[PDB]
Amino acid sequence: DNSYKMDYPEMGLCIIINNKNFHKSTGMTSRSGTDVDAANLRETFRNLKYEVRNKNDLTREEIVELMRDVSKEDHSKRSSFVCVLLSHGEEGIIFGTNGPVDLKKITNFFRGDRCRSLTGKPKLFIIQACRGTELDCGIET
Amino acid sequence: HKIPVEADFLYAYSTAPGYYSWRNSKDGSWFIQSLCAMLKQYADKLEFMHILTRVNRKVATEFESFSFDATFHAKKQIPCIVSMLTKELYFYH
């Protein structure tokens, strides 16, 4: 019982939210290069046998709705769940195209008591987003 | 008889708390480039935390920013693995 059971009929869903273009009233820049990431992720997770769904340029309300609906699906025949978020961010926050959403609101839909068909199964969130505005100057080795 | 509601989550963040994360306009983000490379090379062999540790080393060692703005130039990044997992995760059966 040291390893998760990954031999359910399906590996599971891999939801990729790819936000490139932001409303200019947010003050956020376009995320040039993010489509390269989204295509690379789609191919990588297809080769791991995940059912990949790519969504592009979602508002904060669309992100919350998508995640709520996915957490309401029957995952009984799936081994795991993966969500990849590609956006701007700050600590604790990911951006919709129209403004910030708390990461905890998104991940709470998948809590063990709220998404019962994923209880006991690994729920992976992969987050490409800033977490603040500090820069790491590095140290020479 | 029960498990915690917060158990069995893994958050693979591209960068440490408080920090910017870097993205290249031609090649994609440094973290996702590295994650996809390490999954392609090692998903049939290594456990997922060990794949993510290879991602951390790839991002930390092979990338350094280039900017015409000196304030943004020669900067570095370390991703941040946050695991509440209770078991090892292998992508092959």
């Binding site: 995320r31 701007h88 490409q128 | 910017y20 870097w22 290249n24 306009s25 983000s29 943004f72």
Partner: peptide, 4 residues
């Protein structure tokens, strides 16, 4: 190279 750009920041997020």
């Amino acid at each position: 190279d750009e920041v997020x």
